[PDB]
Amino acid sequence: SDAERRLAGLERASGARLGVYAYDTGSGRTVAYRADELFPMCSVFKTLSSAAVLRDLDRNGEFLSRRILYTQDDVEQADGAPETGKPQNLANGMTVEELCEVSITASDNCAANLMLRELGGPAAVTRFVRSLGDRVTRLDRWEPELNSAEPGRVTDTTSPRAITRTYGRLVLGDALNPRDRRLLTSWLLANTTSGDRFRAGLPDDWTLGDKTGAGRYGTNNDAGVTWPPGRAPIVLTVLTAKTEQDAARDDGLVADAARVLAETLG
Secondary structure (H helix, E strand, O other), rough: HHHHHHHHHHHHHHEEEEEEEEEEEOOOOEEOOOOOOOOOOOHHHHHHHHHHHHHHHHOOOOOOOOEEEOHHHHHHHHOOOOOOOOHHHHHHOHHHHHHHHHHHHHHOOHHHHHHHHHHOOHHHHHHHHHOOOOOOOOOOOOOOOOHHHOOOOOOOEEHHHHHHHHHHHHHOOOOOOOHHHHHHHHHHHHHOOOOOHHHHHHOOOOEEEEEEEEOOOOOOOEEEEEEEEOOOOOOEEEEEEOOOOOOOOOHHHHHHHHHHHHHHHH
């Protein structure tokens, strides 16, 4: 009641559409605001593509050890290659493990496209989440088109409720085997893109594993799992979207939404 009231207040001020879903595994308390509305997913999908490689492609580290050599063409068409674009990487290639990792920690567009290629395309991600009971989340296009984020578009979307449940199953549930779960979690904990978002809004002594997403129409998302000192983990997702194509994303709205959640949960 009051949680949602504070959130609608943040929404009214920002001029953006706000979608939040958080679940405290300790208390069982949940916070829901536009939790079932669709929002453009953007890079939040990278956690899913990486998880799919782990569950479906890799058996005993065999596939993770494969080295993939890509081209300047791959780097350029992805329109985002923070790690993959480095000369040394472009020169020597990167292993599947490294590519799954940087897809998350640096949100590398090129690394994700390479993983989608191994998976069989964007639909392999939809098939993967569908196997986990998620009937909302869907990936339809490649980088960078999937970030188009038009308000009337239904492709490449998810809901705050859906993605929180799916992320929860991957990190805290049994969607993956123990080894794979530990690998995926280590990548989330190593994220470097949340500085002005969830990491800015949660107390500095709370451990955080998350994945961000930003695209056109001022979309700005953050989804992850956080562990307050001495307490059970909280799975939380904040999706935000605007209606003007070139609107500026609001990092403060995402950080502020997290502040409300930190003061409400844990």
